[PDB]
C-alpha cells in the first residue's frame, strides 16, 4: 500500500510455511545489502 493510496484485502492468503524450509535462497549469508528494496520498486517493476 502506497501511503497515499487505498488499502485492500490480501487477495492471496497462501503464504503459510507449508514448505517449512527457508530454501537457502534469500538468506543473508549470500546477499549484498546496499539499499532496501522499497515497495515503490515492487510496484514500478512488478516482475523483477
Amino acid at each position: 500500500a502506497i501511503p497515499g493510496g487505498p488499502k485492500f484485502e490480501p487477495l492471496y492468503k497462501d503464504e503459510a510455511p507449508e514448505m517449512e524450509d527457508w530454501n537457502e535462497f534469500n538468506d543473508i549469508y549470500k546477499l549484498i545489502i546496499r539499499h532496501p528494496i522499497k515497495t515503490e520498486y515492487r510496484i514500478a517493476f512488478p516482475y523483477l
Binding site: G4, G5, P6, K7, F8
Partner: protein
C-alpha cells in the same frame, strides 16, 4: 473538444479529479481518510 454527446446530468462527477490527484498537505486525519476511501471506491469500480 468543441463537439460531444451530451452526457446525463448525473454522469458528470465535477470533483473526481480532486481525489484522483494527491491529497493537499496539512489536512486533518478525517479529510485524508476521506480522500483515500473515495479513491479506493473508484479503483474498485475500475478494476471490475
Amino acid at each position: 473538444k468543441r463537439s460531444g454527446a451530451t452526457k446525463r446530468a448525473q454522469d458528470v462527477p465535477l470533483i473526481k479529479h480532486w481525489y484522483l490527484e494527491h491529497c493537499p498537505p496539512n489536512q486533518p486525519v478525517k479529510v485524508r481518510v476521506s480522500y483515500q476511501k473515495l479513491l479506493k471506491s473508484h479503483v474498485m469500480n475500475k478494476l471490475h
